[PDB]
Amino acid sequence: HASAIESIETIIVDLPTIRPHKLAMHTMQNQTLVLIRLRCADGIEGLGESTTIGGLAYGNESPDSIKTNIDRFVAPLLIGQDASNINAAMLRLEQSIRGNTFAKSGIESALLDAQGKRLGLPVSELLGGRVRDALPVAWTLASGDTAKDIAEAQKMLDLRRHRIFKLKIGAGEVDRDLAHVIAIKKALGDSASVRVDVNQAWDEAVALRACRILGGNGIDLIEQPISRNNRAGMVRLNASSPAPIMADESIECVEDAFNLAREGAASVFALKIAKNGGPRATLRTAAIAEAAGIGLYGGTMLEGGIGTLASAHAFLTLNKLSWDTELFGPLLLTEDILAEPPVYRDFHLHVSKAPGLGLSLDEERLAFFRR
Amino acid sequence: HASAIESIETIIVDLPTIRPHKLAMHTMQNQTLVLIRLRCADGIEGLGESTTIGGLAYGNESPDSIKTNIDRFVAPLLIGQDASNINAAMLRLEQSIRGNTFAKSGIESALLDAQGKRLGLPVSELLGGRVRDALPVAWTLASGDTAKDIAEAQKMLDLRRHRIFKLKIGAGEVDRDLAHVIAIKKALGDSASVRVDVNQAWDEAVALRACRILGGNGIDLIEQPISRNNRAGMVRLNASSPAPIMADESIECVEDAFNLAREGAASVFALKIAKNGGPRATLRTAAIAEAAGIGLYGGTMLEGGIGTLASAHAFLTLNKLSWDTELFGPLLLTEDILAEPPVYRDFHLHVSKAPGLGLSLDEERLAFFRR
Ligand SMILES: O=C(O)C[C@H]1C=CC(=O)O1
Ligand SMILES: O=C(O)C[C@H]1C=CC(=O)O1
Ligand SMILES: [Mg+2]
Ligand SMILES: [Mg+2]
């Protein structure tokens, strides 16, 4: 085919971050991305990104295993295939490859980037058409220090960078974390929306009390308080919690989204291209959530500019993202591999109408930071 | 510690098989294993095996990615740790590594082999004590030809090799697969037990009819008829099916076993060390099943001698394996990496009382077959 895929290269890139990021199960000291370079016969290159958090501390795919499985299994399946038919290509992968959503996400992003360049349309238009050009962006407070978090939040407010804050908790004693969260909300007052993310750290026995306390103290959303394995517990917590609960880790594929909606496991769903298998699969998850009356949140796995924009282009097509987004990945990184970084200002990420993902590689930065 | 782990080597080995093995989603032409060689400071080496089917066509871990994740993440966590405290070592892995059960299974198998040699006890005794020395072994008919399958079954029966047969279906038109299964049962009659495995291939709409037909035609068990994602459907099928349904792919961790039991998704559970994370994790899944009144089946991912014996030692401790086992993996291989293959005779696999997994590596064959 004229647009036949000729090569697929995966490159692991290590990048520095602005400060340590403490999750309930891991403290990030930096970040690693997997770049996908997909070239077609018509002389078009598509760029994609597969990124996770803390090696295998967060999910089952590591930057390393992602490269291994793409090179050994994905590449052989797609080389020679028509890059202009994205649906056919991704379904071809799905029939021979189980799981590996992070890898699939990077591959589809690259195909979409290439296809956008091929038609001279931004990805958002390939996906149906945008209903907005800007997306609100929340910021995560996870320095591990209450005073430091409050100061950072106030700074983002003064600089008009962010006004929605996500607090990582679950690593310490419950009462200590709650006091931490309550203190932050008290200091910010109505100037900001404060939410928490427990990353599955609590047992239901602890969450049933903690959620009641958070809800009574102005916390707007409680993300994945307990293990995705306590299916019945998540349902029960939705009933006892005066604050809405959001599913994140509970969604590891589109089918999970349906089952959670069926069971009533959460009233808000985080949307992550890495967890669903790309922008298109993520839109199927959003469609399921919308059909069920579940709120949407534009999530991230802390990707750099490529993965962040691949996510953004999908979110631009959604009628409503009631809980906003957390597309701040490129801002947590002190360095990326793009010639120009995504555009952030006045609490939002502004997406251009340039072809594909509207970005270009900084060959020099890539060559320097690539592993 | 005197038993500190000093090194962990992972070796991918490609071995030849006796014939094409046709699964609903993939046809095997040979088998690939990942050998784990774990050496301790006290001069003891433990051997383990992590094996899957068809690259990524069956699960999210490939022999390739298993080696990558063990070398890059598991090794660093374990080198220096006391090899004689298996529980502490595996929990150490669990707190930093999500998923990767196939990899974990190989690691724990190696640790068990080493600890068995260290104490001069077979792995079955380390796990509490065996209640039998032999395990009944079923045989999978998957040549893709009715006449050939019947002939092979008749050969295995008359050789007193196997009298329980598992038929893989789901790759063809439903009525064609049903005719195939029924023809086989009709040819063997009461001399053998015939069961099927659909590997999630059917939609519930198809299964609700197909299960009734199979149950009305002498088929004893229906393994994973539909997708593990149709949770509500598996429950509904248990009610309409006159033949018991066994969960296999639905179990990808111990927690899944609990949820399936809670929901009533199957009346029999397949037990696979690769799906649970090793012999010990599999015994926890077995405990959950027993506590729920669910039948047990000794499953396999077509492991060679090492993985099969690691599985066998755990199954020897179970009070009852109502649905027997399918530990025939070594019989599918024309050459393995064990000095002496497992002992099969009179419809059973006979396990010795030798220390550890009671086996010795065939260094010559390892050197010849390794990548
Ligand atoms: O929250 C997660 O599970 C993943 C990621 C999103 C932002 C962040 O701080 O971590
Ligand atoms: O069936 C499976 O799921 C895995 C394995 C067990 C025997 C066999 O033929 O394949
Ligand atoms: Mg989260
Ligand atoms: Mg099976």
SS3 string, B182-198, reads HHHHHHHHHHCEEEEEC
**Residue listed under structure tokens 């496991």:** A265
Q: What is the resolution of this structure in A?
A: 1.8
- How far away, in angstroms, is A223 Cα from ligand 3 center? 7
Which residues in B lie closer than 8 A to residue A100 (C-beta atoms)? 56, 60
Chain A nearest CA to B115, separation (Å): 27
Contact with chain A for residue B27, Cβ under 8 A: no
Q: Is B353 a catalytic residue?
A: no
Whole-angstrom distance, CA of residue A217 vs CA of residue A167: 14
Check if the beta carbon of residue B305 is closer than 8 Å to that of residue B359.
Answer: yes
Q: At what angle do helices A279-292 and A254-263 cross, to 10 degrees?
A: 10
The full DSSP string for B202-214 is B-HHHHHHHHHHH
- How far away, in angstroms, is A202 Cα from ligand 1 center? 16
Whole-angstrom distance, CA of residue A272 vs CA of residue A274: 5
Check if the beta carbon of residue A312 is closer than 8 Å to that of residue A295.
Answer: no
Locate B119 and state its tokens: 């104490």
Locate B257 and state its tokens: 């076993």
Locate A275 and state its tokens: 């967890």
Point out the ligand nearest to the CA of residue B167.
2
**Residue listed under structure tokens 């970040």:** A31
Whole-angstrom distance, CA of residue B172 vs CA of residue B176: 7
Point out the ligand nearest to the CA of residue B270.
4
Phi, psi of A251 (to 5 degrees): -100, 105
Locate A18 and state its tokens: 């602005």
Task: Compute the Cα dihedral for B188, B190, B192, B197 and give only its sign.
Answer: positive
- Nearest to residue B299, comparing CAs of B239, B366, B261, B252? B252
**CA B221 to chain centroid:** 17
- Nearest to residue B48, comparing CAs of B118, B111, B120? B111
B140-to-A150, A315, B194, B195, B343 alpha-carbon distances in Å: 63, 48, 10, 9, 18
B5-22 and B27-40 beta bridge pairing: antiparallel
Instruction: Tally C-beta pairs within 8 A across A and B.
Output: 85
Contact with chain B for residue A96, Cβ under 8 A: yes
- How far away, in angstroms, is A45 Cα from ligand 1 center? 29
Locate B73 and state its tokens: 């993440």
**CB distance B326 to ligand 2 below 6 Å:** yes
**CB distance B300 to ligand 2 below 6 Å:** yes
B338-to-B32, B60, B191, B216 alpha-carbon distances in Å: 15, 27, 33, 43
B145 is known to lie in a ligand binding site: no
Task: Write down how long chain A is.
Answer: 371
Burial of A222 per CB tally in 10 Å (0-12, 13-18, 19+) = buried
**Residue listed under structure tokens 């050939």:** B148
A366-to-A11, B151, B192, B279 alpha-carbon distances in Å: 9, 60, 63, 44
- Indicate which residue of B168, B185, B272, B275 is catalytic: B168
Q: Do A56 and B69 touch (CB under 8 A)?
A: yes
Point out the ligand nearest to the CA of residue B246.
4
Whole-angstrom distance, CA of residue B278 vs CA of residue B104: 6
Method: X-ray
> How does DSSP classify residue B138?
-
Residue A342 contacts by C-beta under 8 Å, 6 or more apart in sequence? A305, A308, A309, A312, A327, A330, A349, A351
Contact with chain B for residue A176, Cβ under 8 A: no
Contact with chain A for residue B217, Cβ under 8 A: no
Give the CATH class of B121-356. Answer: alpha beta
Residue B47's SS3 state is strand
SS3 string, chain A, reads CCCEEEEEEEEEEEEEEEEEEECCCCEEEEEEEEEEEEEECCCCEEEEEEECCCCCCCCCCCHHHHHHHHHHHHHHHHCCCECCCHHHHHHHHHHHCCCCHHHHHHHHHHHHHHHHHHHCCEHHHHCCCCCCCEEEECEEECCCCHHHHHHHHHHHHHCCCCCEEEEECCCCCHHHHHHHHHHHHHHHHHHCEEEEECCCCECHHHHHHHHHHHHCCCCCCEECCECCCCHHHHHHHHHHCCCCEEECCCCCCHHHHHHHHHHCCCCEEEECHHHHCCHHHHHHHHHHHHHHCCEEEECCCCCCHHHHHHHHHHHCCCCCCCCCECCCHHHHECCCCECCCCEEECCEEECCCCCECCCCECHHHHHHHEC
Q: Do A62 and B55 touch (CB under 8 A)?
A: no
Contact with chain A for residue B105, Cβ under 8 A: no
A271-to-A12, A26, A100, A308, B34 alpha-carbon distances in Å: 24, 22, 17, 12, 35
Rounded (5°) CA angle A19-A49-A134: 75
Which residues in B lie closer than 8 A to residue A94 (C-beta atoms)? none
Counting atoms of ligand 1 from 1, which one is nearest the CA of A197?
Answer: 1
Whole-angstrom distance, CA of residue A318 vs CA of residue A321: 7
**CB distance B336 to ligand 2 below 6 Å:** no
Residue B304 contacts by C-beta under 8 Å, 6 or more apart in sequence? B15, B31, B33, B49, B51, B329, B330, B333, B336, B337, B338
Which residues in A lie closer than 8 A to residue B26 (C-beta atoms)? 96
Locate B43 and state its tokens: 């001069």
Locate A211 and state its tokens: 């959620």
CB atoms within 10 A of CB A169: 27
SS3 string, A261-283, reads HHHCCCCEEEECHHHHCCHHHHH
| Atom 5, ligand 2: residue with shortest CA distance | B301
Burial of A108 per CB tally in 10 Å (0-12, 13-18, 19+) = buried
Task: Compute the Cα dihedral for A15, A19, A24, A25 and give only its sign.
Answer: positive
Cα pseudo-dihedral A68, A72, A74, A76, rounded to 10: 160
Task: Write down how long chain B is.
Answer: 371
Bridge partners, residue A345, by sequence: A348
Whole-angstrom distance, CA of residue B211 vs CA of residue B168: 14
- Nearest to residue A134, comparing CAs of A353, A352, A350, A358? A350
Residue B11's SS3 state is strand
Check if the beta carbon of residue B62 is closer than 8 Å to that of residue B29.
Answer: no
Contact with chain B for residue A62, Cβ under 8 A: yes
Q: Which residues of A are catalytic?
A: 168, 326
Task: Compute the Cα dihedral for A208, A214, A217, A218 and give only its sign.
Answer: negative
Q: Do B69 and A73 touch (CB under 8 A)?
A: no
Check if the beta carbon of residue A294 is closer than 8 Å to that of residue A265.
Answer: no
User: Which residues does a gap of C–N over 2.5 Å follow in chain A?
Assistant: none
Burial per residue of A307-341, b for 16 or more beta-carbon CB atoms within 10 angstroms, e otherwise: bbbbbbbbbbbbeebebbbbbbbbbbbebbbbeeb
Whole-angstrom distance, CA of residue B366 vs CA of residue A46: 42
- Nearest to residue B288, comparing CAs of A357, A316, A229? A229
Q: Do A255 and B227 touch (CB under 8 A)?
A: yes
Bridge partners, residue A27, by sequence: A22
Whole-angstrom distance, CA of residue A20 vs CA of residue A236: 34
Burial per residue of A7-43, b for 16 or more beta-carbon CB atoms within 10 angstroms, e otherwise: ebebbbbebebeeebbbbbbebeebbbbbbbbbbeee
Bridge partners, residue B298, by sequence: B271, B325
Cα Rg of chain A, angstroms: 20
CB atoms within 10 A of CB A252: 18
Locate A242 and state its tokens: 């005066």
**Residue listed under structure tokens 């179990």:** B251
**For chain A, what are the domain ranges?**
1-120+357-370, 121-356
Residue B231's SS3 state is helix
- How far away, in angstroms, is A248 Cα from ligand 3 center? 5
Q: Is B326 a catalytic residue?
A: yes
B348-350 and B343-345 beta bridge pairing: antiparallel
Q: Do B100 and A64 touch (CB under 8 A)?
A: no
Q: Tell me: domain A1-120+357-370, CATH 3.30.390.10, correct?
A: yes
Locate B103 and state its tokens: 């990899």
Residue B92's SS3 state is helix
Whole-angstrom distance, CA of residue B59 vs CA of residue B43: 35
Residue B300 contacts by C-beta under 8 Å, 6 or more apart in sequence? B272, B307, B308, B311, B325, B326, B327, B328, B329
